[PDB]
Ligand binder design. Sequence first.
Ligand SMILES: Cc1cc(C(=O)Nc2ccccc2F)no1
Ligand code: NA
Length: 188
Amino acid sequence: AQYEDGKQYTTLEKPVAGAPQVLEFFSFFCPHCYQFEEVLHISDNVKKKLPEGVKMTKYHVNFMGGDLGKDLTQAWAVAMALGVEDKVTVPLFEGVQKTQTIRSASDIRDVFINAGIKGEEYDAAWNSFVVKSLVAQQEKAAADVQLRGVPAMFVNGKYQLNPQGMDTSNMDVFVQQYADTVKYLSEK
Ligand SMILES: Cc1cc(C(=O)Nc2ccccc2F)no1
Ligand code: NA
């Protein structure tokens, strides 16, 4: 077959009911995740190949970066709660991996304030139980798919993308194969 179970994707032994149709896990400490976001724009190209309005979800993980990694999961919950993902993703990746200026929770906050989120608004969100529930949702989703590495993408809670075997000599062709594979999986 052109798309083979065990090759370009793997079938979860324990499917996840009610899972988002497209579910991505990442860490701001994760180098391939930085590439997937700012160099390849995987999510945006996957979105362009899927039907209008399909549910795409992106969650942060705790298992990289120790204490600051877990602060970033909570900051990503703030980003989701406020709808400012597109304003903070690049500066958070740069702060962790490029400049290494993000060393504390206060440095994470600085990124949000520089991006235009008012300090009072950030602090109210950070301390809110809406954000605690989003943190719990991110942890539970990772536990559901039994997650040990990022970046990772899961489709309809049933299939995991496997990019390892794909030709990466041309970034545009790779991104196209990735997105067409997500499309194929979503149509199964
Ligand atoms: C924010 C943010 C998201 C990512 C990321 O890795 N996206 C991604 C792309 C394709 C497949 C799985 C993925 F998790 N990095 O930063
Ligand atoms: Na194509």
